[PDB]
Every structure is written in C-alpha cells, then in structure tokens.
Amino acid sequence: MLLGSHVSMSGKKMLEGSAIEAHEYGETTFMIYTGAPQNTRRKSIEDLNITKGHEVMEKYGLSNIVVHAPYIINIANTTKPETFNLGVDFLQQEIERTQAIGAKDIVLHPGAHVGAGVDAGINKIIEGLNEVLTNDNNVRIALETMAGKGTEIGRSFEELARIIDGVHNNERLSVCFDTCHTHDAGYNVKEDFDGVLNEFDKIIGVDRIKVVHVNDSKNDRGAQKDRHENIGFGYIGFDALNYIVHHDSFKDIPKILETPYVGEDKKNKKPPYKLEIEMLKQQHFDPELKNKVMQQ
Ligand SMILES: [Fe+3]
Ligand SMILES: [Fe+3]
Ligand SMILES: [Zn+2]
C-alpha cells in the first residue's frame, strides 16, 4: 500500500527530515514542497540533503515520493508578467531539483485566470508549460484537479484535457487526482467513484493519474470551497475515501493525505496522518480519531 502524506522539507535535515517524519507516521511514500509552499525561495540542491534522505527512505521502505510546486505559482496569469515569468523560471529549476530528489511528478495547480477568463488562462498555461518542458528530462508535471474556487483552472477534466492537448511535449504531463477538489467541483466521488473514473478515462485516461491526494471535505458536493477535512469527518466520508484508497486503479500510484491538523487552538494543532493511515489500513472508521489526534 503506497500511502503517506505531505511532510516537512525544512531545517538542516531537509529530505532526511521528510523521510524520518514519514516513517514516524507509518507511511510508505510522502510528498514534499522543495521549500516554503508560499514562495519560490529555495536552498541549493546540495543543501536538500538528498543522499542522506535516500538512505533513510531505503531504511524505512519509503518510495515513489512526490513533489508539489508552491501554491503561489500562476502560469495562467496573463496581466502580471513578473508572476508568469517567475513561474516559468521556478518550474524549470523545480524540474532539476525533482530529478535530483528522484520524484517522478511535480504536482502543479494549473493556475488562476484572475479575471482574464478560462480561454486566456488555459492559453497562458500552455505557453508556460511549453517554456518549461522545452528541456529534455523525464520528470512530469502532474496537473492537479482543482475545486473551482475563485478563478482556478482545472475544475473539470475538460479543462485539464485542453491544457494537455495544447502542450507540445504533452507526454511529460500527468494528473494529480484530489478527492476533495473533485468532490467540491461537483464530481460524485462519494457514491459514483467508478463513474467519475470512467468519465476521466473518456476525457484524459486514468493511466495519466500519477498522484492521488486523499482528503475529505468540509463542504458538500459542488460547493467549490476547497476546505479539507480529516478522513471520514467530512461530506465524502470514510466508506467512500477507503474505497478510493484501496482502489485497484490506484494500486501502484502514491496516495497522499493533505488533511488538516487537529487541535483545541492554532498553538496546539497536531498532525492527523498517523491515525488516518492506521484507520485506512484497518478499513474501519474510528469516530474517536479527532479526539485522539488532539491527545497525541
Ligand atoms: Fe495542491
Ligand atoms: Fe491536493
Ligand atoms: Zn485543496
């Protein structure tokens, strides 16, 4: 079972710390940002501490790890050229970092059209990806399914297919399927997950899903709000998320929790991943999970 979470990529230990943390939570894979998720500031490849990170991954049975690009990348931005240019430059550097880390995919939010409209934004993403994937290398960009909050592009499989169709080196594209995002966009992942996969197979191809993000939602189907919830405590629920986690279509695809920390206040937030993974491995919902996460 290839199941883990977002983990830290910080401090002196960098990737070694990621691997230690993933093992702490009983993971077999994990996802990192290559630095702060909120910016493009990054340490040198040497300071990512990759050789030691790989040694700890080998010791603890961690494989198939994932990189996520910072959430501030917006290569759909048609009216702020410094933002577009920074996104292109950053992603070229991220591909080099990711090759060194040994992840197959960089998860990328396609972007936000910020009032220029979907057509202009998709054309801009295509332009940016054509700049980024010009260089040869096998790391893929995994376009994330998005909730459709604000001016996000990627709320439908059709929007993702338009980007894939426009990019020249489109073999270097994959998809990251996020259960919260697809639910919030309106896909019936709770009660018709196989129907959602069949729609995905028609439009894109399920073989292109190279990362799965496993998140419940604080909102009902179609709400377009993108507020993650702990596994089984939201509007998708345990049975549906457990079904997705164990689904044969995803057997050799890393599954990554991005669920919220639990705490009595923001100074006491604790990670839920260890207990969520235990629950998913047992295939039995634990109503006490939030109470127990706070007690860790
Ligand atoms: Fe994301
Ligand atoms: Fe996600
Ligand atoms: Zn989200």
From Swiss-Prot:
EC class name: hydrolase
GO molecular function terms noted in the UniProt entry: deoxyribonuclease IV (phage-T4-induced) activity; DNA binding; DNA-(apurinic or apyrimidinic site) endonuclease activity; phosphoric diester hydrolase activity; zinc ion binding
Catalytic activity annotation: Endonucleolytic cleavage to 5'-phosphooligonucleotide end-products
Highest taxon of source: Bacteria
Positions bound to Zn(2+) 1: H68, H109, E144
Biological processes, Gene Ontology terms: base-excision repair
Residues that coordinate or bind Zn(2+) 2: E144, D178, H213, E258
InterPro entries: AP_endonuc_2, AP_endonuc_F2_Zn_BS, Xyl_isomerase-like_sf, Xyl_isomerase-like_TIM-brl
E.C. no: 3.1.21.2
Positions contributing to Zn(2+) 3 binding: H181, D226, H228
Cofactor: how bound: Binds 3 Zn(2+) ions.
Keywords: DNA damage, DNA repair, Endonuclease, Hydrolase, Metal-binding, Nuclease, Zinc
Cofactor: Zn(2+)
Function as written in the Swiss-Prot or TrEMBL entry: Endonuclease IV plays a role in DNA repair. It cleaves phosphodiester bonds at apurinic or apyrimidinic (AP) sites, generating a 3'-hydroxyl group and a 5'-terminal sugar phosphate.
Similarity remark: Belongs to the AP endonuclease 2 family.
Protein's recorded name: Probable endonuclease 4
